[PDB]
Design a binder for this molecule. Structure first.
Ligand SMILES: CNc1ccccc1S(C)(=O)=O
Length: 119
């Protein structure tokens, strides 16, 4: 019932994601010189360094907010891809499956801890 435990759990999951070769295209903001039309397609850029820095700054109040930003990395990739079999899109699908498999318990434990706090 530790209400604060999600933060270190999210730090550890971000570390695993940065160790994954599939996270390479998503570790830093998309290069606007290489993809000059990116901001025409994508309203809210997001990347894993921005997520990690937001967490370390103490600017997430809950793991749901961190989830929303990570899911935005994956939806931006889906929105930009010219095809459903593109290399970078396919890397984002595998990384998304890995992230969802691991964030499930972090979200459940946090929500359970908050319910216990208000019992
Ligand atoms: C070729 N680049 C690509 C393809 C599909 C999805 C995302 C990207 S991006 C601009 O985020 O690197």
């Amino acid at each position: 019932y530790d209400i604060q435990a999600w933060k270190k759990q999210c730090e550890e999951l971000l570390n695993l994601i940065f160790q994954c070769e599939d996270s390479e295209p998503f570790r830093q903001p998309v290069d606007l010189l290489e993809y000059p039309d990116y901001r025409d397609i994508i309203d809210t850029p997001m990347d894993f360094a921005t997520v990690r820095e937001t967490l370390e700054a103490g600017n997430y109040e809950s793991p749901m907010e961190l989830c929303k930003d990570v899911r935005l990395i994956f939806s931006n990739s889906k929105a930009y891809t010219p095809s459903k079999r593109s290399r970078i899109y396919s890397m984002s699908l595998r990384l998304s499956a890995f992230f969802e498999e691991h964030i499930s318990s972090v979200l459940s434990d946090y929500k359970s801890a908050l319910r216990f706090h208000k019992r």
